[PDB]
Structure 1
Amino acid sequence: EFPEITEEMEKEIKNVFRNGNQDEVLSEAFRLTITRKDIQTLNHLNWLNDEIINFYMNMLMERSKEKGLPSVHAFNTFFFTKLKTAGYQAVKRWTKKVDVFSVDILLVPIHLGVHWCLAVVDFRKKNITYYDSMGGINNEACRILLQYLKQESIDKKRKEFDTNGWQLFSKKSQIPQQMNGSDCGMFACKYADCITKDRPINFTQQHMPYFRKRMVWEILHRKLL
């Protein structure tokens, strides 16, 4: 199923990775700003900074708007933990001007101390389901998001959420595992990629260095092959 890594690309990539002006502006839209510094986080085995993920979670979402594909709203990264730490009142609010329910999937990117992970609200599958590459379980996260839903429902559509029939859980040795030290934020993104395309998951490790380079062009040009 693989898009090729054409010469035209490799040359623009290797260029933006070379030690240059770290604050160079590079790419806009999404009210996000992507610099050579931000880009640098996709090189070798670097830890992916928030800015990249948010950007990817916008394209993941922007794509989920085209026909034959589950519509998606994605929250920024800081959402989850600002909820976990501060509670609901704090993020009321971030969803003024979105009916969270009028969508098929919710994308929740999570930052756990020194670690990336993903949680997915599938309104149509009726199960909040959490994804860690290193295989660590976070049932709490699910229980929290569910609370969000309950609360949000009261605050937006002035009625209690129908909790009936919903599943909450976390994935284990059933999917692809981390297999190194830094490809978490990577897994997280490409995890979501298959989810958003209703496609199964399929990739494992070696697909990562490829996905890494591939992501860069995907980012600069906004476009996800």
Structure 2
Amino acid sequence: QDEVLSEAFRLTITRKDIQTLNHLNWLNDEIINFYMNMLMERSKEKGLPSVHAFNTFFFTKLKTAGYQAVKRWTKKVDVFSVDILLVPIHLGVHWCLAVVDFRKKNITYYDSMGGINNEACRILLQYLKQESIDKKRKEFDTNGWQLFSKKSQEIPQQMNGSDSGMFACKYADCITKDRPINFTQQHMPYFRKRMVWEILHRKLL
């Protein structure tokens, strides 16, 4: 509908959105970004990597308009003062995730459909290069940085044409907890339920 149901992080999730989490429905940017926000909230706890998530508009914008077009999006946050940078990626009718881990010192792309996109990682490393200059006025040290993409046999793949967003989210969930990705397609239906919960509650079970 239009009726707001839950709300935080200066965001508002409505019934229309929550419904996208339903059975086999394609999730929308509202769910992804809200969920991503909860992960960044939880990242405050000790024992967890500090995390910063960009909204699902950043990468596309950064890819089609260049750095000069998103440089001000990070005006109130020092990207390099966190451990993990979450980059949800929208590919028109499919969802993906790119993750910058300054600790492991590498940029890895995650696709539940087996795609590769190492280009996405190059775009991001370039980004890190422009930020380090625009914001910290020094030149980024790429030494040791690994740009790669997880292979279909390395991470749980989806078996339908809808859970892409779900995998993206859960991948980040596990990644943000420094825990091995240990779920499968079989869990998706549950995960969807647990999220309409977690979101209306604003708390990650």
Distance (Å, rounded) in 2 between the aligned partners of 1:69 and 1:58 = 15
User: Residues 67-82 of structure 1: matches in 2 within 5 Å?
Assistant: 67-82=46-61
SS at match of 1:169: strand
Distance (Å, rounded) in 1 between the aligned partners of 2:114 and 2:30 = 24
Distance (Å, rounded) in 1 between the aligned partners of 2:19 and 2:73 = 29
State whether residues 23 and 189 of structure 2, in contact with CA within 8 Å, keep that contact through their aligned partners in structure 1: yes
Deviation of the 1:156 alpha carbon: 0.4
SS at match of 1:81: helix
Deviation of the 1:178 alpha carbon: 1.1
Distance (Å, rounded) in 2 between the aligned partners of 1:166 and 1:103 = 16
Q: Which residue of 1 aligns with 2:188?
A: 208
- 1:57 pairs, out of 36, 40, 53, with 36
Distance (Å, rounded) in 2 between the aligned partners of 1:29 and 1:134 = 31
Which range moves more in the overlay, 27-36 or 213-222?
Answer: 27-36
- Could you state the TM-score of these two structures normalised by the residue count of structure 2? 0.98
SS at match of 1:181: coil
SS at match of 1:27: strand
Q: Which residue of 2 aligns with 1:19?
A: none
User: Residues 25-174 of structure 1: matches in 2 within 5 Å?
Assistant: 25-174=4-153
Deviation of the 1:143 alpha carbon: 0.3
Distance (Å, rounded) in 1 between the aligned partners of 2:9 and 2:83 = 21
Distance (Å, rounded) in 2 between the aligned partners of 1:118 and 1:136 = 11
Unaligned runs of 5+ in 1: 1-21
Distance (Å, rounded) in 1 between the aligned partners of 2:23 and 2:4 = 22
Which range moves more in the overlay, 131-140 or 167-176?
Answer: 167-176
Which range moves more in the overlay, 50-59 or 28-37?
Answer: 28-37
SS at match of 1:45: coil
> Alpha carbon RMSD of aligned pairs, Å?
0.6
Q: Could you say which structure has the higher strand fraction?
A: 2
Deviation of the 1:173 alpha carbon: 2.3
Distance (Å, rounded) in 2 between the aligned partners of 1:27 and 1:90 = 31
Distance (Å, rounded) in 2 between the aligned partners of 1:147 and 1:201 = 27
Which range moves more in the overlay, 169-178 or 86-95?
Answer: 169-178
Q: Deviations over 1:82-103 (max 9, x none)?
A: 0000001110111011110000
Q: Deviations over 1:134-159 (max 9, x none)?
A: 00110110000001000000000001
Distance (Å, rounded) in 2 between the aligned partners of 1:27 and 1:223 = 11
Distance (Å, rounded) in 1 between the aligned partners of 2:13 and 2:19 = 10
- Structure of larger gyration radius: 1
Q: Deviations over 1:107-131 (max 9, x none)?
A: 0000012110000000000110000
Distance (Å, rounded) in 2 between the aligned partners of 1:76 and 1:173 = 25
**Which gives a bigger RCO, structure 1 or 2 (Cα 8 Å, sep 6+)?**
2
Give the length in aligned residue pairs: 204
- Displacement over 2 Å in runs of 4+: none
State whether residues 99 and 108 of structure 2, in contact with CA within 8 Å, keep that contact through their aligned partners in structure 1: yes
- Could you state the TM-score of these two structures normalised by the residue count of structure 1? 0.90
